[PDB]
């Protein structure tokens, strides 16, 4: 449809293409390496739906300086979808966004 969905669910809608934006100058979906070497092509979107947040936000290893991250999973199947990023300072724009990992989404980008 209009939306990007949880690949495991196939049909649980997570965001819409209208929510994609460029935060990093590398673009709206760039490759990021986590502290264990795993590469996440991370699509940045303003808003997301049907996600559960796991745990407390953390700034350790954050790919977006000034933002903390919280693991986000599909609320229907519990598959990892990405992370919610929340600003640590009130003057930052946007104050929050979501980074969705490419392999967790359908259709295949």
């Amino acid at each position: 449809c209009t939306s990007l969905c949880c690949k495991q669910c196939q049909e649980t809608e997570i965001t819409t293409k209208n929510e994609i934006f460029s935060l990093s100058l590398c673009g709206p979906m760039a490759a990021y390496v986590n502290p264990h070497g795993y590469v996440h092509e991370t699509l940045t979107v303003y808003k997301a739906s049907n996600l559960n947040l796991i745990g407390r936000p953390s700034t350790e290893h954050s790919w977006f300086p000034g933002y903390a991250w919280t693991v986000a999973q599909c609320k229907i199947c519990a598959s990892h979808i990405g992370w919610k990023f929340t600003a640590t300072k009130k003057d930052m724009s946007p104050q929050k966004f979501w980074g969705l990992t490419r392999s967790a989404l359908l259709p295949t980008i």
């Binding site: 986590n34 264990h36 795993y38 796991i54 745990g55 953390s58 290893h61 991250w69 693991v71 999973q73 519990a78 598959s79 990892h80 992370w83 990992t101």
Partner: peptide, 24 residues
């Protein structure tokens, strides 16, 4: 105390981490 190397999800028990990790 136990952390998924793929996504950063934290777990109190090693057994939940293992089930979670192999779901990736």
């Amino acid at each position: 105390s136990f952390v998924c190397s793929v996504c950063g999800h934290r777990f109190t028990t090693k057994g939940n981490l293992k089930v979670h990790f192999h779901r990736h």
